[PDB]
Amino acid sequence: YSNEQEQVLGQIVLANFANNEGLASQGDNVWAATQASGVALLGTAGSGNF
Amino acid sequence: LDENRNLVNMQGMQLTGYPATGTPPTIQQGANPAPITIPNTLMAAKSTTTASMQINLNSTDPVPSKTPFSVSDADSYNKKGTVTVYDSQGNAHDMNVYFVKTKDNEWAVYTHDSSDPAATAPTTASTTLKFNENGILESGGTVNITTGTINGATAATFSLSFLNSMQQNTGANNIVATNQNGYKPGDLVSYQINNDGTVVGN
Amino acid sequence: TKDNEWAVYTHDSSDPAATAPTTASTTLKFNENGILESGGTVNITTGTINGATAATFSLSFLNSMQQNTGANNIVATNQNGYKPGDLVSYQINNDGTVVGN
Amino acid sequence: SMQINLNSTDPVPSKTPFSVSDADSYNKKGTVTVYDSQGNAHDMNVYFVK
């Protein structure tokens, strides 16, 4: 910002799946969470598994 | 790798193999085949129990000048080694060990803590190392050491064995290796399969 | 607060007239190895919003291991509540369980 | 029945007392599975020390 300050507007979430090659495509370069594919299992950028 | 984290073929026929149990887990050779899974959960820390430390010592090691043994003056000891131990909650403690030479074929070993704020510097010898005329350890190579408490944790007494040591003029003195069977907690980060079918987690 | 003991406070950040937690909602007391013993569940109530009834429910912290896991990191959370919504599509799974979305 | 081949030239286990956690104290560990009356299988671990 214009007073030598910084702000945070949120964080990017990376949702690793317990099952790759099990996602389903519903259009453009985009998948949807389905059965036999895993729960969202959210997470931050650099923590561990990601 | 399906919903329940089970290794399975493209249709839904779960993979099978020898189950593994223990700590560290070992492949039960004759066990009945059972499904192989990949638990994403974390394994709890196991406190150090069997720490071992080899050392290469010298026959011509001079006697320390200052005979009052201490931990401040470097002249108080001939050799200094260090190992790491783990509490019951994954906290790491540092165990120092000092070797001094009074006369030939005889050495005095003193342990010391460096993480407990209430650990007073001792002078009592932890044990004695007795050596052959050729430089082979005789006895006194089994010790039990208990640490202190660190922020609400109970100590874990470990067996320290200076097995297969030697003092046969390796120039100076140096530790060959240090190890134990204790580890911190940690989460699953990667898995693989070796060329012998033993599935491996990291 | 001390060795093997934590205090748990709560706050509804959506209530316009909420109050900062003066006391502890509960207290977690841990086994020496790092196993949770007490303060497993606690009754928690929230405030009414837009003329709608408030929610009184249970909040549980079971199966929590404080064992020097690096730094602090929440492992999992779960509820059973959901916003009202409409149908989009159905399907038939591999065991005949016709389930909607 | 358990038919097993034993190596003649294998050495005596290092640790003289019989340990159950580490293999230094036993030569060969095998496992068979027997069945009880109710049907719950029991794993019989056999330990061989020369």
Cross-chain CB nearest to B151 (options C3, C33, C94): C3
Q: What is the resolution of this structure in A?
A: 3.4
The H helix count followed by the E strand count for chain A is: 0, 2
Measured distance CA(B145)–CA(B148) in Å, rounded: 10
B55-73: b (≥16 Cβ within 10 Å) or e: bbbbeebeebeeeebebee
DSSP chain B: --TT-B-B-SSS-B-EE--EEETTEEE-TTPPPEE-B---SPBPPB---EEEEEEEE-TTPPPPS--S--SSSGGG-SEEEEEEEE-TTS-EEEEEEEEEEEETTEEEEEEEESS-TT-PPP-S-SEEEEE-SSSBEEE---EEE----SSS-----EEEE-TT-EES--SS-EEEEEE-S-B--B----EEE-TTS-EEE-
Determine the length of chain B: 202
How far CA B156 is from CA of B49, B88, B91, B184, in Å, comes to 7, 7, 11, 14
Lookup result for tokens 């003649």: D8
Contact A19 B188 (CB under 8 A): no
- Contact residues, chain B, for A20 at CB < 8 Å: 1
Residue B161, min C-alpha distance to chain A (Å): 36
Measured distance CA(C1)–CA(C6) in Å, rounded: 5
Taking every pair of Cα atoms in chain C, the longest distance, rounded to a whole number of angstroms, is: 54
Determine the length of chain A: 50
Pairing of the two strands B25-27 and B34-35: unpaired
Measured distance CA(C34)–CA(B47) in Å, rounded: 13
- Judged by a CB distance cut-off of 8 A, whether residue B21 touches chain D is no
- Judged by a CB distance cut-off of 8 A, whether residue B133 touches chain A is no
Residue A21, min C-alpha distance to chain B (Å): 9
- Is B152 buried (19+), middle (13-18) or exposed (0-12) by CB count in 10 A? middle
Which pair of tokens denotes residue A49?
Answer: 């598994």
Contact C65 B45 (CB under 8 A): no
Measured distance CA(B96)–CA(B109) in Å, rounded: 10
Measured distance CA(A39)–CA(C78) in Å, rounded: 12
Residue D15, min C-alpha distance to chain B (Å): 13
- Contact residues, chain C, for B44 at CB < 8 Å: 33-34, 65, 67
Q: SS3 for D23?
A: helix
Q: Is the dihedral of CA B32, B37, B41, B47 positive or negative?
A: positive
Instruction: Identify residue B54 by its one-letter amino acid code.
Output: Q
- How many C-beta atoms lie closer than 10 Å to residue B112's C-beta? 18
Measured distance CA(B13)–CA(B8) in Å, rounded: 6
Is residue C92 within 8 Å of C84, Cβ to Cβ?
no
Q: Is the peptide bond before B25 cis (omega within 30 degrees of 0)?
A: no
Measured distance CA(B106)–CA(B104) in Å, rounded: 5
